[PDB]
């Protein structure tokens, strides 16, 4: 005997401050791979609709959430890594994809979760000015770990000889700039990419689109949704003091039991609504049909 | 018997390979053709 939920409570964060996404893709100068930037987007609504309007991305892949669900979802911390690479390196930015040269510069965590974005920078980064200010490390005595950037530039002791300051045969300079060309072939155009690390750890969600905050209701099991927590149970205040940190709770069966609301700082107690079991006590149908 | 039942519950808190352990946090992340494989993992595990 399963009681279906009545309505669909939704409770997303309060404000509707647009997230500064126009200065992520559409920006002037993108630092090279040997030193990329960290863009911490914090406590804002991010309407991905314009990120569906602004649709000029050549390659778009993510390994965590799906873009179908990116709209009706939330995140707690977001970080973006904007830079530029070769035309043949746009396929190298993928978790576990061992780069012939793309591990020295930028590696992706195999545990990644978030959508990477790439689009052709031929009209902005390939000009007559040579644009040799785009650089990338070519070799190093060790391969980097995913979210670490070796912005250092030292001499390389190739051939096992101390080439202290001098660049000679097998003493090369690692930070070799990009051999870009204004309006070169397809394989060699400068590609402008940007990743997004959606930290989906269960913490108070900040960066997500707006959805209709419906008023709380007690003792009525409803198809609620707290930042993706699509639970369908009754609601009540919880006696036990929740944590001043994250808004989510757990139990032995990893099915949330008590939460705290995004907007109001009131404690909630979740419980799947009345569940029992029918048992059709029947005499033989050859004798009746009443059960 | 009580301990058998008590160890049957704690199998709901097992990833079994999937990127979560609860079926509301797989359909709130992935899409049908891509969440179906995760749920296939979880369901063959829980059925086992």
């Amino acid at each position: 005997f399963r009681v279906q939920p009545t309505e669909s409570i939704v409770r997303f964060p309060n404000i509707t401050n647009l997230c500064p996404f126009g200065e992520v893709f559409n920006a002037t100068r993108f630092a090279s791979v040997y030193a990329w930037n960290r863009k911490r987007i914090s406590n804002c609504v991010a309407d991905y609709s314009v990120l569906y309007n602004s649709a000029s991305f050549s390659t778009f892949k993510c390994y965590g959430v799906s873009p179908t669900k990116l709209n009706d979802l939330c995140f707690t911390n977001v970080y973006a890594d904007s830079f530029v690479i070769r035309g043949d390196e746009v396929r190298q930015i993928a978790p576990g994809q061992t780069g012939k040269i793309a591990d020295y510069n930028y590696k992706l965590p195999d545990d990644f979760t978030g959508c990477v974005i790439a689009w052709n920078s031929n009209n902005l980064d390939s000009k007559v000015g040579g644009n040799y200010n785009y650089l990338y490390r070519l070799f190093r005595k060790s391969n980097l770990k995913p979210f670490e950037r070796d912005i250092s530039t030292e001499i390389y002791q190739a051939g096992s000889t101390p080439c202290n300051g001098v660049e000679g045969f097998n003493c090369y300079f690692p930070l070799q700039s990009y051999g870009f060309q204004p309006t070169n072939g397809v394989g060699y155009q400068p590609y402008r990419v940007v990743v997004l690390s959606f930290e989906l750890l269960h913490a108070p969600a900040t960066v997500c689109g707006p959805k209709k905050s419906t008023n709380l209701v007690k003792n009525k099991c409803v198809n609620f949704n707290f930042n993706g927590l699509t639970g369908t149970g009754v609601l009540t205040e919880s006696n036990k003091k929740f944590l001043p940190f994250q808004q989510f709770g757990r139990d032995i069966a990893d099915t949330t039991d008590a939460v705290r609301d995004p907007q109001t700082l009131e404690i909630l107690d979740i419980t799947p609504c009345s569940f029992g079991g029918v048992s059709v006590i029947t005499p033989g149908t050859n004798t009746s049909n009443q059960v | 018997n009580a301990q058998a039942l008590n160890t049957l519950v704690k199998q709901l808190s097992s990833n079994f390979g999937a990127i979560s352990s609860v079926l509301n946090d797989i359909l709130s992340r992935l899409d049908p053709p891509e969440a179906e494989v995760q749920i296939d993992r979880l369901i063959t595990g829980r059925l086992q």
Binding site: I252, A253, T255, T271, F275 | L5, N6, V9, L12
Partner: peptide, 30 residues
């Protein structure tokens, strides 16, 4: 006959040393 259930003196010394929330979790998970 003192008890409502017609147990005995020695049956009572038994129904106390076994004793047979968690049951709510099991009830909710089916």
């Amino acid at each position: 006959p003192s008890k409502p259930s017609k147990r005995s003196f020695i049956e009572d010394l038994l129904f106390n040393k076994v004793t047979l929330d968690l049951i709510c979790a099991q009830k909710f998970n089916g």
